[PDB]
Symmetry: D2
C-alpha cells in the first residue's frame, strides 16, 4: 500500500492552487454586489470562462472520451484546493461534471461523442446539469407503492413528452434561463401522468433519462419550459439551481440516454455514488479553510494575554479535533475513489464505500468549522474573517447530493442488509 | 421542588407572545431593505419604541428601584418567546438590560436614582450598554502578568480621562453614534497609559467602571469619542456593537460607579454571571423555533413517499434529540436564575451554576438547529424557511457574552479548583 | 417554580446516605467471594433484610396503601444516594418497587390489601418482580401482525394456564428459585399457543397480568415452573434475573390483576413509564460516584507535575462536562416525576416526559463515567479504584428498563407523531 | 496512491487469522479457571510458546536485525486479526515488541546482536518490557521545573545504580517475577537520588535507559529488585504489568543503551510514537469484533418482530457509525505507520501523524463497542456474548500507551505550536 503522490498529482494541485489564488479570489468583488442568486450566478460567468481556459472543464471527462481527467484522486486534489479558496465557480465545474456523468457512464460511443463535444473543446462556457431533484422530495423516489418521481415521460409517436417539475439541479436553467448546454432529466415513465404510479411495479424499472439541450428547448413552445423560481440559499450564494416546470415538453427519441428501466436507474445511482465520494473533497476544502484560518490566528494572537492562544489546552484540543477530522476525511475520500476505480470489485462494495465517505466527510466538515469558530472566539463571527461564509457553505454538504439522513444512510443500510454483504471486501478482498 | 407557573408568569408569557407576534413579525419588512449593520439597526428603532410602550425596558429594572421586573423566571420566559420569533429588537432589550445591571447592583441609591430614570419612564427609546469588550480580546483581562485591559482611566482633577478602544458592546453608540443613553465603561486604572500593567498587582484591584451618558459625549471634543467601525455580523444582523476609540475623554468623578478594585470587578462579574444564565433563554428560543419548524414539517410532509417523515426512525431520532436538548436547557436556566436569587447561597455556588448554564445551553442550541435542518433536509437550506437565519443566529451564543472556551469554562474551572468547592450545594444546601 | 427541598426531603437523603455508608459498604466483602450470579445475589440477602428493617421496602408503597412513600422526588433523592455508593441490594429495592407497581396502580382495593401486605410489614425479605421480558425480545411485543409475547395464558375452568419463557426480570425466582413473593407475569392471551398471534387483532387488546406467588408455584407440579439459567452480567453482578419456563402452569382466576386487554396493557405501560423516570436517579448515582472520585483525585494529584491536574484545561473540561451532565440529568428526573404526579395533565404528556428522561439520563451517564476515567488516566483501569465497577454498571442503564433504541425512542416517537401532540404541555400547560 | 495488498500482506493476514482461530481460541479455557492477574498471565505461557513457534516474536524484529518483520502495514494487519479474536497472549507479543524497540532503534550493532538474540531464535518464551511508567504518573516527566521521573540512576565506578519504582510496564517481571528476558528501564540521572531535579536543566537532557536482564537481577541482592504488587485490571485480565521497586540495583555500564540525554529521550520518544500508531490496530481489532458480532446478530434476529432488526433505521444508524469509525481508523493507522517508514519526512511530521492516530482510533473504538451494544440491546450485557469482555478491553486504549488527555494531545499540541509546523507535510510533501 502507498500514499505517495506522483509528479502530475503534485502538478494538478499546484495548477489548481495557482488557479484559485490568481483567478477565484477576484470573484467576490464581482458577485458581492449583485441583488439575487441569479445575478450572483451571472456575475460568475467570466470565472467559469477562465476555468474552461485553464482546462478544468476538460479535466472532468476521462482521457478515453477525449478529456484530460487523469484519475479520481487527481480530481479529489483539485476539488479540495478549489473549495479551500472559493466555492463560487468551483461549484459550477463539479455541477457540470455530475451532468456529464450519465453520458460518461453509458456504453454508447456515438451519443458520448456528440454530447460531450462542447465540454472537451477548451472553449466557451458550456454548462451541464443532472436534473434529478423535485419540489416534493426524492428520498423516496424508488419506494415501491409510493408516488415516485413527479416528472414523468411518455412516448408519443417518435418523441418523448416530459411533464412535471425539478428543483435544485445546479446549472439547469443555464446562464440565461434558456437551458444548460446539456441537461440529463430523470423521469418516471407514465402513459397517463394523472394516474398514480402502479403500486405493483418496481419503480426502478420505470426510470428514463432524457437528454435536453438549448436546441431542444428552442424547438418547444415557450410555455413548455418555464423557470418558476431561484431559491435563495444560505451558502453557495453564487450557484443557480432553479425550479423548472415542463409542460408537454417534446424531446427526440434519439435523446433517450438508454432503454428505460434498471439500466437507466443504474446510471443515475453510479453518477450519484461517484459524486458521493467526490463531494467529500468539497467538504474537506471548506473545513480545511476554517482550520487553517483558526490555526494561523491561534499561533499569532494572545487574545490579550501573555502567550499565543494555541498554548491553551482547550484551544489546542479544538484544532487537534479539526485536524483529525480533516485527515481521516481525505484518507476516506481517496480510499473511496480508488475503490470506485477498481474493476475487480462488486458494485455494492463500491456503493457502500461511497455512501460512508459522503456521510462521514460531510457531517464532520460541519463540526470542524464550528470548532474552528469556537477556538478563534468572538472574532470568527464578523465578516472580516471567513467563518461566516464557511459556516453557511459547510451546512450544504450534509444536505446536498443526496441527504445523509434520507438517502445515503438508507442506501448504505440496504447494502448492509443483503445476505452476501462483505463488510471488508474493499480492503481485504472478497471471500 | 415544584415547577408550576404562576398566573403572573403565564401572563408574562402571553404578553411576550402577543408583542412578538403583533410587533416583531413586522420588523423584517423594514430592515431587509437596508444595506449595512447600522442602517438595519436604525430601522429597528420603531420596534424598540413599541417595546418601551409595552413596558419591556422597564420590566428590566427591579421593583425596589422603579421598574416592573417580577422575577428572573419571568424574564427567562419573556426572552424565550421573543427569541423564538425575532432576535431583532429583542437583542436590544437584553443589551440594554446588561448595560443597566452594574447600576442596578451597586451600593448607591443616588446613582441608582439618577441613571435608571430614563429606563423606568415608559417613554422614548433609551439604550444602555455595558462596555467591556476590546479589539485585543478580554478572556485574559484578569490575568496577573498580562497586558490587562487596553481601555484605561487616569484621575485628573475632579475628572477621569479615558484612553483606549472597545469592540462588540451592543448598543454602545446609541441610535446615531452620539452614544448610548447609559454606557458603563470597564477600565484598567493606569496613571501612565503608555506604561505596561505592573506584573505584581492583581489586575482585579485596578478595575473601575465609569458611567458615560450622551451628555458626557456632548461635553467633550468631537475627536475624543469616535466610532472607527461597525462589524458586519454573521447573524443578529440588526444589532450594533461598534468599534469605539476614547482619546482624552473626560468623565466627572461623580460618574464613577463605585470604588476601583475588587468591588468594581465583583460588579462586572455579577452582571456577566446573571447574563450568563439568561443567555440560555435566548438560545432556547432560537433552537425552539428550529425544532418547531422541523416538527411541523415532519408531521405534515411525506417527502414524496407514503408517510409523514416523522414516521422514519432516523428523522424522529433527530427531533427527539432536539426536544431533549431544549427541555434540559430550560430546566437548567430556571434552576440557574433561581440559584442567583437565593440569598442563602455563597457567590461561588451561583457563579458555577450560571457558568454551566451558559456553556450547556449555548453549545447544545447549535446542535439542535443543525439536527432540525438535517431532519428537514435540502429545503432547510433556502430562505423561504427560517433555518438559514437561525443557523447564523445560533452560532452567536457559544461565542458571545463571554465565550465558553476562553471565559466561562475557566471561570467554572477556577471555582471547581477552590479547596472548599461544594459541587451539589445549589441543590442539597451547603455543609 | 421552586427548587428548595423540604426538611423531610433532606431527611430522606440523610437516612439513605447513612444506610448506604453503614450497611451497603459491607456487602462487597460478602459477595466478592461468591463464584456466580446466584451466589452473589444470595450473599446480598442480609443487606436486603437491613433495607427492610430500615423501611426502604415500605417507602416503595404509597401512604394511602399503608406504605411510607412521601413522594417521587423523595424517591429520586433516595435512589441517587444508594446508587452513588452500591447498586447491590439497591437494585433489589427498585426491582421490587417495579414488581409492586401494577398492583399499586390498579383500582382494586381488595387485591391491594391482599398482595401488598408483606411489603408494608417491615418484616422478612419479601421480593417482587415485574415479569415482562423474554428470550426472543420485547421491543416489538405490541406490533400488530408480529408474533407478540411468547408467554401466553388461556382460561381453563376457574384457572389460567401459563405457557412459555421469561428472561431478565430482576428478583423473579426469589432468593432460592422457588419464586418471588409477588411476581406480575405479563402474558398474551391465547387459547392455542401452537397458533400464531392473530394478525388482525390489535396486540394490546390481548394482554393479561397474572399474580404468581410462592404459594402459586408450590401448588403446581414440580416441572411447571423451572429456572433454566442465570445470565452472568457485565455489571450489577449481584442481581438475579433468571431464565424461567412455564409449562402448563396453573394460576387461580382470583389472581388475574384485571380484565385482559387495554387496561392490562395500560398498567404495564404506566409502571414502566414510572420506572423510566426513576431509572435516571440510578444513572445519576453511578455517574456521580465516577465524577466525584475523579474530582477528588483531580484536586489531590499532580501526576508527577507541579500543579494539581484540575489545573490543566483538558482535565477541567472533562469534569465540567460530567458535572453538566449530572446537573441537567437530575433536573430532568425531578421534572419528570413531578410531571407524573400531576393530575391536571394527560397521559401522553407524562409518557413523553418520562421517555426523554430515561433516554437522556442513561446515555449521558455512560459518557460521564468514561470522561471521568479519561480525566484520571491509567489509574482508573485498576480495581483499586471504583471505575472498573462503575463502567460495567453504567452500561446497563441505556440497555435495561426498556432500551433507548428499540423501546423508549419508539414510544416517544409515537407520542410525537400524534396529531394532538403538545411539546411543552408539561411546562406551559395544554392549549385546550 | 495505492491501497492494494501484496501477496505477502494477504498471507500475513491468513497466518494471523489461522493462529488466532486454531490457537488463541483455546486460551480462555485455561486462564478463566484462574484467580488473579499473574496466574491468568502464567496460564497464557503455552499460547505465547505457540506464538514464538509460529514466528510471531521474530516478526517483531526487522529483517536487517535478523528478524522477519516485513513492514509496519504487515504488522498492523497481524495485530488487527489477533485482537479481533483474543487479546490474551496477543498483548504479550506487542508489549515485547515495544520493549525491544529502543534496542532495535539505537545504532549499536553490538547491543543489538547481544540483546535481540533470544527473540530471533524461534525458541522458548522470551519476554521484553519497556519500563517507563511510574506510580506517580508520567504525563509530566519532561516538565522543566517538575520533579521528573522518580526512578533515578547514578554512576558508581564502571556501573550504574538504580533507585525507584515502576508501575504498569507489561511483561516487566517475566513469567515468574525474576524479570523479563529484556527490560529497558528509563531513569532520570541523579547523583543524589534524594535531591530534587534541578529546575534549571531541561529534563530531556537527563534521561538514561538501562538494559536489565534476568542475569542482571540474579547478579544482585534478592531485595534490590522487589515486585510489590500486581494491579487487577478492568480488562486485559491476563497481562502482567507489576509494581516493581529497584533499591540500589547495580547494572554494568555496558548495558547503558546510549549516551544519557536528548538521545536516550529520543529513543523513548520514537519507540512510543511507533507504538502510538500500532496501538490503533489493537483498538480496531476489539471494535471490529464488537461490530461484527452486532452485525451478524442484527442480520439474523428479529427481536420478536416481523423483520431482522437491521431493517430499523435506528439500528442500522449505529452499525453505519461503527463501520465508519472502523474504516477511517484503519486508513489512519496504515497512513501513520507508512508515514513513519518514510525516510524523506522529518520526525515532527511523523510524530504528529502518530499522535493523531492513537487519539482518534482509541477514542472512537470505545464509541464503536458501546454503539454495537446499544444496537444489540439487553442481550449484549451478558457473558454468553463477547460484549462484556470487549467493553472492558476497549477502555484500555484511550488510557494506555500514553493517555490521550495527558500525553498524546500534549505531544501533538506542542508540534502544532512550532513556527515551522506543516499540517499537511505527510500528504502533500514539504
Ligand atoms: C451580538 C453581540 C453582542 C455582544 N454584546 C456585548 C456587550 O453588550 N458587552 C460586551 O462587553 N461584549 C459584548 N459582545 C462580545 C461578547 O461578550 C464576547 O463574548 C467578548 O468579545 C469576549 O469574546 P471571547 O470569549 O471570544 O474571548 P477572546 O478574548 O476574544 O478570546 C478568543 C478565543 O481565544 C481563546 N482563548 C483566549 N484566552 C484563553 C484562555 N485563557 N484559555 C482558553 N482559551 C483562551 C478562546 O478559544 C477564545 O474563544 C457582543 C458580541 C456580539 C456578537
Ligand atoms: C447547491 C446545491 C446543488 C445541488 N445539486 C443538485 C444537482 O445537481 N442535481 C439534482 O438533482 N439535485 C441537486 N441538489 C439537491 C440535493 O442533491 C438534495 O440532496 C436533493 O434534493 C435531495 O434532498 P434530501 O436528501 O433532503 O431528500 P428529501 O426528499 O428532500 O427529504 C428530506 C428529508 O426528509 C427525511 N426523509 C425523507 N425520506 C426519508 C426516508 N425514507 N428515511 C429517512 N428519512 C427520510 C430526511 O430527514 C431527509 O433529509 C442540489 C442542491 C443544492 C443546494
Ligand atoms: C439488571 C437488569 C434488570 C432488569 N429488570 C427487568 C424487570 O424487572 N422486568 C423485566 O421484564 N425485564 C427486566 N430487564 C430487561 C430490560 O428491561 C430490557 O430492557 C428488556 O429485556 C428489553 O430489552 P431491549 O430494550 O434491548 O429490547 P429487545 O427486544 O431485546 O431488542 C434488542 C434491540 O433490538 C433493536 N430493536 C428491536 N426492535 C426495534 C424497533 N422496533 N426499532 C428499533 N430497534 C429495535 C434495538 O436495538 C434493541 O435495543 C432487566 C435487565 C437487567 C440487566
Ligand atoms: C495493559 C497495559 C499495558 C501497559 N504497557 C506499558 C508498557 O509496556 N510500558 C510502560 O511504561 N507503560 C505501560 N502501560 C501504562 C500506559 O502507558 C499509561 O498510558 C501510562 O502510565 C501513562 O498514563 P497516563 O496517560 O494516564 O498519565 P498520568 O501521568 O498517569 O496522568 C493521568 C491523567 O492525569 C491528567 N494529566 C496529567 N498531566 C496532564 C497534563 N500535563 N495535561 C493534561 N492532563 C494531564 C490526564 O487526564 C491523564 O489522563 C500499560 C498499561 C496497561 C494497562
Amino acid at each position: 500500500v502507498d500514499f505517495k503522490l506522483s509528479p502530475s498529482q503534485l502538478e494538478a494541485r499546484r495548477h489548481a492552487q495557482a488557479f484559485a489564488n490568481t483567478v477565484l479570489t477576484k470573484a467576490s468583488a464581482e458577485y458581492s454586489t449583485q441583488k439575487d442568486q441569479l445575478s450572483r450566478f451571472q456575475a460568475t460567468r467570466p470565472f467559469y470562462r477562465e476555468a474552461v481556459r485553464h482546462g478544468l472543464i476538460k479535466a472532468q471527462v476521462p482521457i478515453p472520451l477525449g478529456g484530460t481527467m487523469e484519475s479520481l484522486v487527481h480530481e479529489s486534489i483539485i476539488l479540495e484546493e478549489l473549495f479551500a479558496v472559493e466555492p463560487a465557480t468551483s461549484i459550477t465545474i463539479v455541477a457540470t461534471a455530475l451532468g456529464l456523468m450519465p453520458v460518461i457512464l453509458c456504453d454508447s460511443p456515438s451519443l458520448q461523442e456528440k454530447f460531450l463535444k462542447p465540454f472537451i473543446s477548451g472553449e466557451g462556457e458550456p454548462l451541464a446539469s443532472l436534473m434529478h431533484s423535485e419540489p416534493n422530495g426524492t428520498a423516496n423516489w424508488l419506494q415501491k407503492g409510493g408516488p415516485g418521481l413527479q416528472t414523468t415521460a411518455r412516448k408519443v409517436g417518435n418523441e418523448w413528452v416530459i411533464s412535471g417539475e425539478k428543483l435544485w439541479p445546479s446549472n439547469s436553467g443555464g446562464w440565461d434561463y434558456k437551458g444548460a448546454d446539456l441537461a440529463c432529466v430523470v423521469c418516471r415513465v407514465s402513459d397517463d401522468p394523472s394516474k398514480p404510479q402502479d403500486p405493483n411495479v418496481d419503480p426502478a424499472t420505470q426510470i428514463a433519462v432524457l437528454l435536453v439541450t438549448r436546441e431542444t428547448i428552442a424547438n418547444n413552445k415557450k410555455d413548455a419550459y418555464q423557470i418558476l423560481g431561484e431559491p435563495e440559499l444560505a451558502g453557495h450564494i453564487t450557484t443557480s439551481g432553479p425550479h423548472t416546470r415542463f409542460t408537454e415538453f417534446h424531446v427526440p427519441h434519439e435523446n433517450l440516454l438508454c432503454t428505460p428501466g434498471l439500466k437507466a436507474q443504474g446510471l443515475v445511482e453510479t453518477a450519484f455514488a461517484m459524486s458521493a465520494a467526490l463531494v467529500g473533497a468539497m467538504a474537506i476544502g471548506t473545513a480545511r479553510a476554517a482550520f487553517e484560518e483558526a490555526l494561523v490566528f491561534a499561533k499569532s494572537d494572545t487574545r490579550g494575554g501573555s502567550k499565543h492562544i494555541i498554548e491553551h489546552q482547550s484551544v489546542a484540543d479544538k484544532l487537534i479535533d479539526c485536524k483529525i477530522r480533516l485527515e481521516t476525511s481525505r484518507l476516506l475520500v481517496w480510499k473511496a475513489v480508488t475503490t470506485l476505480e477498481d474493476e475487480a470489485l462488486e458494485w455494492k462494495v463500491k456503493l457502500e464505500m461511497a455512501m460512508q465517505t459522503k456521510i462521514y466527510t460531510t457531517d464532520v466538515a460541519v463540526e470542524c468549522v464550528i470548532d474552528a469558530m469556537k477556538a478563534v472566539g468572538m472574532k470568527s463571527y464578523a465578516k472580516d474573517m471567513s467563518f461566516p461564509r464557511l459556516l453557511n457553505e459547510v451546512m450544504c454538504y450534509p444536505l446536498f447530493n443526496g441527504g445523509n439522513i434520507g438517502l445515503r444512510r438508507r442506501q448504505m443500510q440496504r447494502v448492509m442488509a443483503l445476505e452476501d454483504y462483505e463488510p471488508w471486501a474493499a480492503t481485504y478482498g472478497s471471500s
